[PDB]
Design a protein around this ligand. Structure first.
Ligand code: BTN
Ligand code: BTN
Ligand code: BTN
Ligand code: BTN
Lengths: 124, 123, 123, 124
């Protein structure tokens, strides 16, 4: 439906974090992600899931994805998930909230996870 | 590293939410998840990532995964991500926080996302 | 410091959720909040805290507050906390993330807490 | 009702973070809080709100509170809110999720906020 093609493409946010994704008819999200901030260099594997038959009543399309911050260049020992919804239209948006967990000892687990939000806009 | 075999298997929480996962040598998590609560029936595909070369200093292994709540039986128009860490050993744990976003109209978007936390133990 | 007069006043977000606050010289926030959405009518008491001696290095001023959604008109059996920072200047902002917990039975507690975010600008 | 007296008293969690609170008939929570972890020393002022007429159907009592991490001994330039519900009974609990925001420059705001959860049990 329009959400598969709508989500597929390149996205970025206002900090210049950016990702390339394909949304499949099987509900899969597959791509790579590049953060402009934090302990990250170059691109990381992204995988996730989305609702391939969203409500047709004006609602967004729910989705989520994960990046573990390890690639051939760098390993931050952390992983981020983004949970949110795709809102289509000519200026499509992906609106998300995210959790960034770092590996820690049990004693430091209380400070293991950052939370934030981010809206991405489609490049093409 | 040990996290590969250690994450691979079947996990559950106190409510009987459960999942089967394989942690690949490449950092992929793939499996199936079943919720005991919510607008959910039977199993849903899970996919995520973990740090396949975690620190060796006693820290946990970071990971995350997603489930979109649509399968052959039901579609709740929602998706959950779990972000957390695997803590190994013979009674291994995966400690998570989670975000459950439901598709909403823009007017309702302020109430789209629930947050919670959950500890799974290996079956 | 400037945060005292700068936080004190009336604030609103894009939806018309609004609050009046006084930031005390002692670190207290006290005021009243009105939501344009949700199970809410008229004004509710707000109370919180802010760092009354923030860093001087250009950082924002940390703060937080709570509203329990019971007043003379309505009781939604819920409470929201906002955690964030005040960024001063002539177009000052309060940038927040928030947690809205509803009273639930233990069985439903996994769905008790919504999460979101909101930026307020000063009227 | 039972929730006012139920919440009033001293609470602690498994790390030995602890607080003393009074829940008022006016919906107020007033007290002080002592963290066993992080950039904190001795006690900090706590203020918050709770539902003074909770549902009588088995539901918990919603509540929340704030601590800014500045006292006469220490200033961490941060503040934490806890949002959750009081569950009464002979072994009463306060179950919460929390957000800890540090003051940051706008550039570092994406890493300003930690998230976690915590269950407190009543001391007396
Ligand atoms: O520092 C790390 O642990 C690895 C990089 C984390 C970057 C975070 S993930 C949430 C936010 N969104 C971005 O694209 N970058 C930051
Ligand atoms: O109700 C829905 O929208 C779909 C089911 C959601 C179930 C949630 S996901 C977070 C928590 N953990 C579980 O295993 N189940 C609930
Ligand atoms: O529906 C309820 O349980 C009470 C009203 C909640 C309104 C929420 S609080 C977070 C967000 N910000 C607002 O100003 N309103 C919504
Ligand atoms: O380091 C700081 O910025 C000040 C202390 C923060 C302590 C946090 S607040 C959430 C968690 N619960 C606790 O009682 N202590 C930690």
């Amino acid at each position: 439906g329009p959400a598969e093609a709508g989500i597929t493409g390149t996205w970025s946010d206002q900090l210049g974090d950016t990702f390339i994704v394909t949304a499949g008819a099987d509900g899969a999200l597959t791509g790579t992600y590049e953060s402009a901030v934090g302990n990250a260099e170059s691109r990381y594997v992204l995988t996730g899931r989305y609702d391939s038959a969203p409500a047709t009543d004006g609602s967004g399309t729910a989705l989520g994805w994960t990046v573990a911050w390890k690639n051939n260049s760098k390993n931050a020992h952390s992983a981020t998930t983004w949970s949110g919804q795709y809102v289509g239209g000519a200026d499509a948006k992906i609106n998300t909230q995210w959790l960034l967990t770092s590996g820690t000892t049990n004693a430091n687990a209380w400070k293991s996870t950052l939370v934030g939000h981010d809206t991405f806009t489609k490049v093409k």
